Write a protein that holds these residues in place. Structure first.
Motif, PDB file in Angstrom:
ATOM      1  N   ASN A  57       1.027  -3.115  -8.250  1.00  0.00           N
ATOM      2  CA  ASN A  57      -0.118  -3.049  -7.417  1.00  0.00           C
ATOM      3  C   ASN A  57      -0.005  -2.455  -6.026  1.00  0.00           C
ATOM      4  N   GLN A  98      -1.298  10.211 -11.667  1.00  0.00           N
ATOM      5  CA  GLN A  98      -2.296  10.871 -12.484  1.00  0.00           C
ATOM      6  C   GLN A  98      -1.779  12.009 -13.352  1.00  0.00           C
ATOM      7  N   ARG A 103       2.366   4.747  -0.937  1.00  0.00           N
ATOM      8  CA  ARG A 103       1.860   5.927  -1.600  1.00  0.00           C
ATOM      9  C   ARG A 103       2.892   6.726  -2.355  1.00  0.00           C
ATOM     10  N   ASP A 135       0.789  -1.215   0.000  1.00  0.00           N
ATOM     11  CA  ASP A 135       0.000   0.000   0.000  1.00  0.00           C
ATOM     12  C   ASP A 135       0.829   1.277   0.000  1.00  0.00           C
ATOM     13  N   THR A 185       1.361   7.579  -5.855  1.00  0.00           N
ATOM     14  CA  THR A 185       0.769   8.747  -6.493  1.00  0.00           C
ATOM     15  C   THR A 185       1.846   9.817  -6.646  1.00  0.00           C
ATOM     16  N   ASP A 190      -1.208   0.902 -16.582  1.00  0.00           N
ATOM     17  CA  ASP A 190      -2.335   0.874 -15.687  1.00  0.00           C
ATOM     18  C   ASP A 190      -2.235   1.964 -14.648  1.00  0.00           C
ATOM     19  N   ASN A 191      -1.865   3.153 -15.107  1.00  0.00           N
ATOM     20  CA  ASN A 191      -1.829   4.316 -14.217  1.00  0.00           C
ATOM     21  C   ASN A 191      -2.718   5.319 -15.005  1.00  0.00           C
ATOM     22  N   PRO A 192      -3.529   6.118 -14.337  1.00  0.00           N
ATOM     23  CA  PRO A 192      -4.377   7.088 -14.987  1.00  0.00           C
ATOM     24  C   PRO A 192      -3.573   7.941 -15.921  1.00  0.00           C
ATOM     25  N   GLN A 202       0.076  -0.592 -12.531  1.00  0.00           N
ATOM     26  CA  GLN A 202      -1.106  -0.555 -11.666  1.00  0.00           C
ATOM     27  C   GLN A 202      -0.899   0.150 -10.365  1.00  0.00           C
ATOM     28  N   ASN A 203      -0.718   1.460 -10.487  1.00  0.00           N
ATOM     29  CA  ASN A 203      -0.522   2.379  -9.370  1.00  0.00           C
ATOM     30  C   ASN A 203      -1.423   3.596  -9.616  1.00  0.00           C
ATOM     31  N   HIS A 204      -1.242   4.705  -8.925  1.00  0.00           N
ATOM     32  CA  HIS A 204      -1.974   5.925  -9.009  1.00  0.00           C
ATOM     33  C   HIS A 204      -1.364   7.207  -9.503  1.00  0.00           C
ATOM     34  N   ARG A 255      -0.137   1.929  -4.449  1.00  0.00           N
ATOM     35  CA  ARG A 255      -0.856   3.177  -4.558  1.00  0.00           C
ATOM     36  C   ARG A 255       0.060   4.374  -4.764  1.00  0.00           C
TER      37      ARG A 255
END
Lengths: 87, 73, 80, 89, 73, 76, 74, 160, 82
Positions: free
Chosen positions: H70, H98, H52, H50, H74, H119-121, H94-96, H72
RNA sequence: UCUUGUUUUUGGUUUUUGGAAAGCCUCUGGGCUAUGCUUUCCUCUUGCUAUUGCACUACUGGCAAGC
């Protein structure tokens, strides 16, 4: 047994002679960097403990010297010893 | 110590030795040593040019040897 | 010593090695020694240049070997 | 183990294996990768995972994923991988 | 009639002698003592490098590793 | 068969002329007749001559070599 | 002696050699000549790497030894 | 479940499939206490956790591969090259992440050659690929596709 | 009857070691063997033609050791006795 | 009781790099020194296209160009 015999008569006797006389020595090394100092103790392999050492070595020609207080030299590095007296 | 090497199978046969200083020799294997000192007969140099000089009976030192080959199976 | 027995155990398999020469040799190993002699067949040499060759039979001196490269199953072997 | 084919065979072997490892790590621990460039085996690879659920997830999610320019084709391997057989018994 | 290295150096003692090293240099001088290893000792030695005198040193010992040659002047 | 030190023993009796090669130096070679030797492969050559690739034959006298530096010993 | 050397057994090591190359991996077997056996080895010639596997080095070839990580439970 | 010294010491340690020393750390929220690995790993697997922010690393000269699947992520820390000089491969699937600007700190990783941000925005942002290529030119393979010359030139026009 | 025995006394002090390789190594000595193989603690070693890098547990294949530059506080007369 | 005499621990030295021949550039010192470039000798990157194949690996398509 026979090791005791050669220390008195043979080549190595002149260090035992010089080091007891409190003498200085010039040593040519395999590193191409001669050592000039006074010796404390030695061995059959020429493993020597030197005190107050000063090196002499060329460069690219520039000669450079450094004083070292205590120095254990592994006899492999030695190639030629010149046992020069003050007197 | 002193493991007498397995050179019995090369005795009285031709060889292609290599030694230190990239120099190499052909010869009939006569005898060998504990330290791998070798006895070669009908010794022929192989110069860097390729000029092959006949010599005769020769004793190669052990230390030097890098390897030992066979020309014919 | 164990570093020698492992060698003797890879007799038969194919081995890679490096010499002071600079070149690497690959082939089936037939006999070894406590000295680190070797006896190999069907060797495929590759020097510093990249020059490949073939050598039918070879003997070596251990003194001339730097290091060997041995098959993977020889890590489960017993160390006594 | 999953069997992948239709891979761009111009990638050097060590780079192929390292990208394969990277890509497939997202689904579970990859135990090993077998890929050769022989005529027979070029353009293919076997990817071995510790967990079986990881292999199934990988298969469904990366079917036809563009890798180095081509869409990869994934399938379950015909046999069990030597490493798996040794790890099981 | 054979002349062996120990007897040779036991008879060489005292006389003028020149000995090379592995690195080209060759030193002349009289000989005082010889160990079981050879391992030479010299007095009043002048260092001839490439057939040219460089420095007169005097009393000397040479480690036995570097000695290439032993002969006489 | 012929072992290596027995082969060198023949070169003493026959007084044959033998040229000696050095370890890490192809540019230099030697010559001379063999008087004696020992277990460590040291050699006492007589009428020894220093030869080169140029063929610069330079005379020496009776000398002794260390066994660590030899590579080849060859008849005539 | 060799009391210290047994203590290193089964640790990931960084071994510098006389050539300059540096091998890395766990230590399985050890000798009086300092012959080392190493598992899953990598050289770092120097921006470089190679995979070998099981490597048996000589004593002549080895310079220095240094622990990379603690002993593995695996 | 803090990433602790004790945690790292009982963690599976092995030689991976690409022949590198890897530590298995596959619910950590913050990357910390890496000192205890003693710089002994070529790869560190932080997948399925998890975290960040990719930050908090000690000086790790060995570390060449970071698998961070996988999580988070950001944000990316700013002094990464100072603690990871030879970082060559970074897998962030596959993270965050943006915003394109959040990927800016990767420009300072001089050896970074393999980068994966799928797989990231951020991926769906206009010009995402060209932006990465111009701002992180040291990357040779991006999202498992070869950075080609034509893309470099095209990224030189836009953003020149 | 060896000068090596004196080096077994040496343990604990820091020394800058030179090797045949041409490196330089500052670090504390833990143990010294009869075959010269020394093990060091908290080391800062530098290679010929590279930047200095700190290592924790360095150990050296004695064969390679040129010389120890000992500290100036160490009394020689006391150590040279058996 | 010994362990410095050929395969390990008392050294045969040292590893794109080194050496040689003139020119150019940069730096330092008061025409000298160092480095690179330029000539000779001793798998990687561009294009293109081939192969769709179930494995356990020196290596792995071929063709042309670049190093």
């Amino acid at each position: 047994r026979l090791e005791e015999y050669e220390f008195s008569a043979g080549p190595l006797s002149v260090l035992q002679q010089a080091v007891k006389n409190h003498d200085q020595v010039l040593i040519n090394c395999r590193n191409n960097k001669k050592l000039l100092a006074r010796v404390k103790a030695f061995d059959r392999h020429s493993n020597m403990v030197l005190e107050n050492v000063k090196e002499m070595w060329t460069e690219k020609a520039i000669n450079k010297d450094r004083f070292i207080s205590k120095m254990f030299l592994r006899g492999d590095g030695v190639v030629l010893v010149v046992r020069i007296p003050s007197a | 110590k002193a493991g007498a090497p397995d050179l019995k199978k090369y005795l009285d046969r031709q060889v292609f030795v290599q030694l230190n200083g990239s120099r190499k020799v052909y010869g009939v294997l006569r005898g060998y040593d504990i330290f791998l000192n070798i006895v070669l007969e009908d010794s022929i140099e192989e110069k860097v040019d390729g000029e092959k000089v006949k010599i005769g009976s020769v004793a190669i030192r052990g230390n030097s040897v890098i390897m030992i080959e066979t020309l014919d199976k | 010593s164990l570093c020698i027995k492992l060698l003797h155990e890879t007799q038969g398999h194919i081995v890679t090695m490096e010499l002071e020469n600079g070149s690497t040799y690959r082939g089936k190993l037939i006999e070894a020694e406590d000295n680190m002699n070797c006896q190999m067949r069907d060797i495929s040499v590759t020097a510093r240049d990249g020059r490949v060759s073939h050598l039918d039979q070879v003997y070596i001196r251990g003194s001339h070997i730097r290091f060997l490269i041995v098959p993977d199953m020889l890590r489960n072997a017993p160390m006594f | 183990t999953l069997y992948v084919n239709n891979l761009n065979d111009k990638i050097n072997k060590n780079d192929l294996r390292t990208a394969l490892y990277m890509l497939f790590s997202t689904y579970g621990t990859v135990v090993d990768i077998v890929a050769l460039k022989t005529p027979k085996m070029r353009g293919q690879a076997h990817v071995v995972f510790f967990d079986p659920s990881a292999a199934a997830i990988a298969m469904k999610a990366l079917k036809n994923f563009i890798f180095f320019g081509k869409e990869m084709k994934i399938q379950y391997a015909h046999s069990k991988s030597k490493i798996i057989e040794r790890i099981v018994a | 009639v054979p002349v062996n290295p120990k007897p040779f150096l036991q008879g060489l003692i005292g006389k003028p002698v020149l000995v090379r090293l592995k690195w080209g240099q060759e030193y002349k001088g009289t000989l005082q003592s010889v160990d079981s290893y050879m391992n030479l000792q010299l007095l009043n030695a002048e260092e001839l490098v490439d057939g040219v005198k460089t420095g007169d040193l005097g009393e000397i010992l040479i480690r036995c590793n570097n000695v290439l040659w032993v002969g006489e002047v | 068969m012929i072992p290596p030190i027995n082969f060198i023993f023949k070169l003493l009796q026959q007084h044959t002329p033998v040229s000696i090669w050095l370890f890490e130096q192809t540019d230099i070679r030697l010559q001379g007749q063999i008087r004696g030797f020992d277990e460590f492969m040291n050699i006492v050559l007589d009428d020894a001559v220093q030869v080169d690739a140029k063929n610069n034959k330079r005379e020496l006298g009776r000398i002794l070599l260390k066994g660590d530096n030899i590579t080849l010993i060859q008849a005539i | 002696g060799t009391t210290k050397m047994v203590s290193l057994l089964n640790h990931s090591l960084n071994v510098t050699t006389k050539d300059g190359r540096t091998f890395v991996g766990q230590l399985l077997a050890f000798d009086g000549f300092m012959n080392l056996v190493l598992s899953d080895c990598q050289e770092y010639r120097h921006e470089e790497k190679r995979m070998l596997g099981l490597v048996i080095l000589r004593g002549e070839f080895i310079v220095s030894l240094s622990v990379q990580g603690p002993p593995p439970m695996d | 479940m803090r990433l602790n010294a004790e945690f790292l010491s009982q963690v599976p340690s092995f030689i991976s499939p690409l022949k590198e020393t890897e530590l298995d750390l596959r619910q950590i929220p913050i990357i910390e206490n890496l000192g205890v690995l003693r710089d002994v790993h070529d790869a560190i697997d932080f997948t399925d956790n998890d975290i960040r922010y990719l930050g908090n690393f000690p000086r790790m000269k060995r570390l060449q591969t970071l698998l961070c699947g996988n999580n988070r992520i950001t944000a990316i820390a700013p002094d990464i090259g100072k603690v990871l000089p030879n970082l060559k491969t970074l897998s962030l699937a596959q993270n965050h992440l943006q915003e394109i600007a959040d990927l800016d700190p990767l420009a300072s990783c001089p050896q970074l050659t393999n980068l994966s941000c799928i797989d990231n925005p951020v991926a769906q942002k206009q010009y995402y690929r060209l932006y990465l290529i111009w701002r992180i030119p040291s990357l040779h393979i991006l999202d498992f596709e070869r950075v080609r010359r034509n893309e470099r030139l095209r990224a030189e026009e836009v953003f020149g | 009857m060896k000068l090596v025995r004196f080096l077994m006394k040496l343990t604990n002090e820091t020394v800058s070691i030179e090797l045949k390789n041409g490196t330089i190594v500052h670090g504390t000595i833990t143990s010294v063997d009869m075959q010269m193989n020394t093990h060091l603690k908290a080391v800062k070693m530098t290679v010929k033609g590279r930047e200095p890098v700190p290592v924790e547990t360095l150990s050296i294949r004695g064969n390679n050791i040129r010389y120890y530059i000992l500290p100036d506080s160490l009394p020689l007369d006391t150590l040279l006795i058996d």
